[PDB]
Design a protein around this nucleic acid. Structure first.
Ligand SMILES: [Zn+2]
Ligand SMILES: [Zn+2]
Ligand SMILES: [Zn+2]
Ligand SMILES: [Zn+2]
Lengths: 81, 74
DNA sequence: CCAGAACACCCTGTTCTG
DNA sequence: CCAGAACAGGGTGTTCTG
């Protein structure tokens, strides 16, 4: 019953190594598999929350990285301990 | 040959009273009618240019109004 | 030439499947 | 539980129509 660490929406589980909602889970996967040459229109600190997370993919992706999301998370936990 | 005064894309003609591109023309009309209440994720001063105009409809719509865009101007 | 409508795509987020 | 795929919708921008 926790909150997505990236956007504070209703979290759905531990995804790519972090507590997140589903939207952030698929957003991160899409961002890492393509290019993430996104551009912030503000000052690289946009507020990423449930209604505003769509505004700035640049800052959203940055928060994903900063919370520790990574593709090999599940496979890394499966080497422990 | 010219420049949209809202997003700086190549403008297409005078729309709603102002030199704008086509995307800004239709954005503005949708903003006034659909009257969604948009919310900035920054500080209400986002850069509105070709690639970023889509990031912040609140600020884009503000820049539209500030450039003089107006529905009943014809 | 411009307003408005239609179309066509992208991005997103929910649901399905392995 | 959680990854990845599929599917459904909203916003955006170009083209079409009045
Ligand atoms: Zn989230
Ligand atoms: Zn940002
Ligand atoms: Zn424009
Ligand atoms: Zn803004």
């Amino acid at each position: 019953s926790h909150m997505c660490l990236v956007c504070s929406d209703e979290a759905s589980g531990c995804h790519y190594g972090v507590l997140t909602c589903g939207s952030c889970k698929v957003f991160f996967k899409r961002a890492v598999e393509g290019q993430h040459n996104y551009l912030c229109a503000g000052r690289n600190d946009c507020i990423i929350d449930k209604i505003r997370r769509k505004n700035c993919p640049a800052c959203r992706y940055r928060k994903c990285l900063q919370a520790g999301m990574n593709l090999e998370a599940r496979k890394t936990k499966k080497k422990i301990k």
